Write a protein that binds this ligand. Structure first.
Ligand SMILES: Cc1cc2nc3c(=O)[nH]c(=O)nc-3n(C[C@H](O)[C@H](O)[C@H](O)COP(=O)(O)OP(=O)(O)OC[C@H]3O[C@@H](n4cnc5c(N)ncnc54)[C@H](O)[C@@H]3O)c2cc1C
Length: 460
């Protein structure tokens, strides 16, 4: 964290850098190096809080010339801890939060450090939206470059399926535009290939009109686990794009809507919504709400921005997390039973075994159209352990590991944006031989020195 820096190279950097630099001796250094995954404790030599594209140019070129290991940071939610490093530079984008929306053209230009909630707020000023993740403080930058799915995804695709161009700062310090008509090889790679190919300082999106959303959440006893998941699995195979339905197995929150008898016990929290007319959605949601007997049932007509802000109503921000995720082509009765066995052993009130159904518009993009793999797998299982006590790491990590291992045989692929710090190994398997090979050629061209290796890495 104290390498010798050449005063010449450093001087040129600050002359060209209009941002704020955070050094290990500064008082805000310890807070600035913390990311969402609180198990990641790392001490960069320097934190560069970039405020503009020229700032990112200055920082990238200062890292290349100085040979510093490069962490790039959007919203900080890397479950692998990629957005902070030991001994290098954090290229921090969090201050680059500015959005422009044209309601007439249904387009949004968003800087590379935006949080989802800032994006959704800006577009919803005009009743517009585009798919993103379900938790507002997730960074738009990392989420999009991995694909990005959420409430709107079954209707309007992944985030990358609404992305029309990017401004990206490559390792040599140049600034490029990547679109379907300009460096289209790089535009294929950034739509699914992570931060491997440069620092995206601006995303441009197509927008869709999204009015009020009929929404429901409820909790089921696990005694009805088998019926519920089986009805969930069977129904989403032929469900319309407009219905999104998700299962979150977890300890029941000690909330008033819920009988105190269920507090602190493993339950299925089913959340659903209808991206369409709210009268149709009311009928549609009631059709899928009694696969089991629903407790703490809350139904609401929400502005889309409120739906985006809903997940999840927790009492405490979890400090420590560990993830194991994977896709499934099918969810058999045998996998359902294993999912239910391991859900019953959930110990922390912050931990969720998530069961998602993508499909819809996601699965109708041709496989090779983006670098995002597994479009044809509809199911996503995510063993998402979360806790507070650093002395309980082993217990919560062991729950996700053994849950993943008993589901291994059914798992068919992995989402790069759910990889944990010990899963660099999984990269080529995750993308598949054909996609990986094309990504390596784009890397060889755009980042031959692998300047950007703090990601699900693709070596050139
Ligand atoms: C609580 C939580 C909820 C989530 N919900 C969803 C969800 O609903 N749907 C979904 O699809 N995913 C979801 N994710 C996963 C999310 O997409 C990834 O964790 C993503 O990497 C987070 O982006 P970030 O910028 O916040 O993370 P960071 O730690 O800042 O960055 C993650 C990676 O992206 C790179 N990166 C970030 N910004 C840029 C940029 N501008 N240019 C180049 N590289 C960049 C970083 O170098 C790093 O490798 C969730 C994650 C968390 C922790």
């Amino acid at each position: 964290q104290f390498p010798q820096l050449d005063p010449a190279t450093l001087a040129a950097f600050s002359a060209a850098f209009r941002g704020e630099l955070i050094w290990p001796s500064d008082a805000d250094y310890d807070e600035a190096r913390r990311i969402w995954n609180g198990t990641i404790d790392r001490r960069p030599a320097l934190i560069a809080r970039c405020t503009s594209t020229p700032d990112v140019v200055a920082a990238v070129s200062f890292a290349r010339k100085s040979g510093l290991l490069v962490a790039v940071r959007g919203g900080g939610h890397s479950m692998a801890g990629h957005s902070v490093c030991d001994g290098g530079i954090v290229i921090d984008l969090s201050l680059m939060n500015s959005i422009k929306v044209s309601r007439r053209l249904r387009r949004a230009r968003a800087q590379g450090g935006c949080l989802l909630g800032a994006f959704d707020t800006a577009t919803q000023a005009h009743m517009l939206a585009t798919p993103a993740g379900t938790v507002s403080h997730t960074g738009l930058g990392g989420l999009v470059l991995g694909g990005g799915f959420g409430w709107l995804s079954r209707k309007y695709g992944l985030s990358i399926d609404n992305l029309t161009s990017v401004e990206i700062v490559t390792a040599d310090g140049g600034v490029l535009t990547a679109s379907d008509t300009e460096n289209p090889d790089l535009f294929w790679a950034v739509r699914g290939g992570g931060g491997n190919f440069g620092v995206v300082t601006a995303f441009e999106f197509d927008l869709h009109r999204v009015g009020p959303v009929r929404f429901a959440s409820t909790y089921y006893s696990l005694d009805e686990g088998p019926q519920v998941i089986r009805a969930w699995r069977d129904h989403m195979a032929t469900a319309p794009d407009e219905l999104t339905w998700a299962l979150y197995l977890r300890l029941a929150p000690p909330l008033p809507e819920l009988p105190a008898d269920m507090h602190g016990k493993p339950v299925i929290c089913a959340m659903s919504c209808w991206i369409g007319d709210p009268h149709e959605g009311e009928r549609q949601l009631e059709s899928i709400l009694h696969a089991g007997k629903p407790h703490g049932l809350t139904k609401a007509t929400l502005p889309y921005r409120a739906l985006q802000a809903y997940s999840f109503p927790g009492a405490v921000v979890p400090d420590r997390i560990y993830t194991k995720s994977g896709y499934l082509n099918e969810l058999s009765d045998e996998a359902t039973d294993t999912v239910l066995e391991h859900a019953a052993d959930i110990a922390s009130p912050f931990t969720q075994l998530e069961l998602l159904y993508l499909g819809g518009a996601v699965a109708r993009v041709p496989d090779d159209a983006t670098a995002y793999p597994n479009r044809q797998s509809p199911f996503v299982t995510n063993l998402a352990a979360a806790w507070m006590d650093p002395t309980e790491d082993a217990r919560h990590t062991a729950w996700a590991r053994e849950g993943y291992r008993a589901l291994a045989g059914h798992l068919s692929g992995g989402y790069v944006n759910f990889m944990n710090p010990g899963e660099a190994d999984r990269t080529r398997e995750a993308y598949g031989a054909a996609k990986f090979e094309r990504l390596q050629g784009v890397k060889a061209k755009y980042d031959p020195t692998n300047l950007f290796r703090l990601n699900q890495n693709i070596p050139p």
